[PDB]
Amino acid sequence: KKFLPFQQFGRDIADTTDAVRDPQTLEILDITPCSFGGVSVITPGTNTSN
Amino acid sequence: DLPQGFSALEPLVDLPIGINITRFQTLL
Ligand SMILES: *[C@@H]1O[C@H](CO)[C@@H](O)[C@H](O)[C@H]1NC(C)=O
Numbered sequence: 001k002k003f004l005p006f007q008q009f010g011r012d013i014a015d016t017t018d019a020v021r022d023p024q025t026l027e028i029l030d031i032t033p034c035s036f037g038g039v040s041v042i043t044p045g046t047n048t049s050n
Numbered sequence: 051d052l053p054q055g056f057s058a059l060e061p062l063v064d065l066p067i068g069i070n071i072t073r074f075q076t077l078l
């Protein structure tokens with residue numbers, strides 16, 4: 001990202017922070033939330049298998 | 051005679067100084 005020198009962080013439409021400045025280094029970091037998703041169980045009937 | 055166009059003013063300076071400002075002057 002092309003952060004302007006005054007910007008401490010950046011944010012998405014949800015107001016969630018997308019990117020930040022580090023307080024101990026002049027660097028700008030992207031933040032990606034952790035991988036997640038539905039756990040779906042594919043099964044035959046318990047009459048037939050576990 | 052202020053030229054037409056578009057510009058975005060950027061913050062540079064921040065002063066915690068609490069001055070009551072109901073007036074101002076220009077130093078030519
Ligand atoms: C954090 O520490 C490093 C190493 O001493 C220094 O270079 C850097 O300027 C410091 N950052 C801030 C924001 O004080």
Ligand SMILES: *[C@@H]1O[C@H](CO)[C@@H](O)[C@H](O)[C@H]1NC(C)=O
Pocket residue numbers: 047048
């Ligand atoms: C499962 O269903 C079959 C019919 O397709 C039946 O013969 C069998 O006894 C059933 N088993 C259990 C544990 O209910």
Ligand SMILES: *[C@@H]1O[C@H](CO)[C@@H](O)[C@H](O)[C@H]1NC(C)=O
Pocket residue numbers: 070071072
């Ligand atoms: C600033 O000064 C004006 C008088 O010129 C006064 O009416 C106003 O209440 C003052 N504001 C503050 C925040 O002190």
